[PDB]
């Protein structure tokens, strides 16, 4: 993905200010809540019977941090997302067989989590910079389907 200098600024700026211990479980949790069919890949996490039960689930929060670690890393290597996500693509595509399209949903849920947390700060232009990132990562994570 190629972000112009202003787009890079807008993303690095807000991202430096993200609580890496919560944003990830929040986006993953909302995904499970907003798109229920995704729970099929987490039968092992336990109680996902209610939104509060999903949001408060420890495994969700724990796994969300990893997912988040994946994005921070993606941001660190935009000019080369393919090589970066190669391994996560083999897992998500070849082992997991994650339904096509799920990666973009989560990116978009991530974007919703970012807006909710930052509010006014997540300006239309700031959001635009993140849709590119999310799309670069979702595309890269799906390279085994290419």
């Amino acid at each position: 993905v190629h972000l112009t200098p202003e787009e890079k600024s807008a993303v690095t700026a807000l991202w430096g200010k993200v609580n890496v211990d919560e944003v990830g479980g929040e986006a993953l949790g909302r995904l499970l809540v907003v798109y229920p069919w995704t729970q099929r890949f987490f039968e092992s996490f336990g109680d996902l019977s209610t939104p509060d039960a999903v949001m408060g689930n420890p495994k969700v929060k724990a796994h969300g941090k990893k997912v988040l670690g994946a994005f921070s890393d993606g941001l660190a290597h935009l000019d080369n997302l393919k090589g970066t996500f190669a391994t996560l693509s083999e897992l998500h595509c070849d082992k997991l067989h994650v339904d096509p399209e799920n990666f973009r949903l989560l990116g978009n849920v991530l974007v919703c989590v970012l807006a909710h947390h930052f509010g006014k700060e997540f300006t239309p232009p700031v959001q635009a910079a993140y849709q590119k990132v999310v799309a670069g990562v979702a595309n890269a994570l799906a390279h085994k389907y290419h």
Binding site: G29, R30, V33, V34, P51, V54, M55, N108, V111, C112, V113, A115, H116, H117, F118, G119, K120, F122, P124, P125, Q127, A128, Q131
Partner: protein, 141 residues
């Protein structure tokens, strides 16, 4: 297909938004034009610059169509009839764009109502927008 809980969550969301409806509708459009550029070609004659009075006036029109949809939630097909005809028949708006705009409408609310945008409410709204979009794309010639 919009459970009672969803109708309640959406109605509650509408209340909180109150009079800011138009303003937020204009914001969602701006967000869409910036995030999904291809959508812009549907508005060649519009000035899409920030603070555009046309984008302002139009975001108010969108907001009123969503409120009319909720005010008549149990029968959106009939209520959104003229708009489905308009978007599908005349405008030829491809289906994917409704998904793009719905997302921006959700991002716009999350950014203005941290209290009401809980996981449950987020899910309900998404179903609401999905339902409205389904109607707006039922009339493809």
């Amino acid at each position: 297909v919009l459970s009672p809980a969803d109708k309640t969550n959406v109605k509650a969301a509408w209340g909180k938004v109150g009079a800011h409806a138009g303003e937020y509708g204009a914001e969602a459009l701006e967000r869409m034009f910036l995030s999904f550029p291809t959508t812009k070609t549907y508005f060649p004659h519009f000035d899409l610059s920030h603070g555009s009075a046309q984008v302002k006036g139009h975001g108010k029109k969108v907001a009123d169509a969503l409120t009319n949809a909720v005010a008549h939630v149990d029968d959106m097909p009939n209520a959104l009839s003229a708009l489905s005809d308009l978007h599908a028949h005349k405008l030829r708006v491809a289906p994917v764009n409704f998904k793009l705009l719905s997302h921006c409408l959700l991002v716009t609310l999350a950014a203005h109502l941290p209290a009401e945008f809980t996981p449950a409410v987020h899910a309900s709204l998404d179903k609401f927008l999905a339902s409205v979009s389904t109607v707006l794309t039922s009339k493809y010639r």
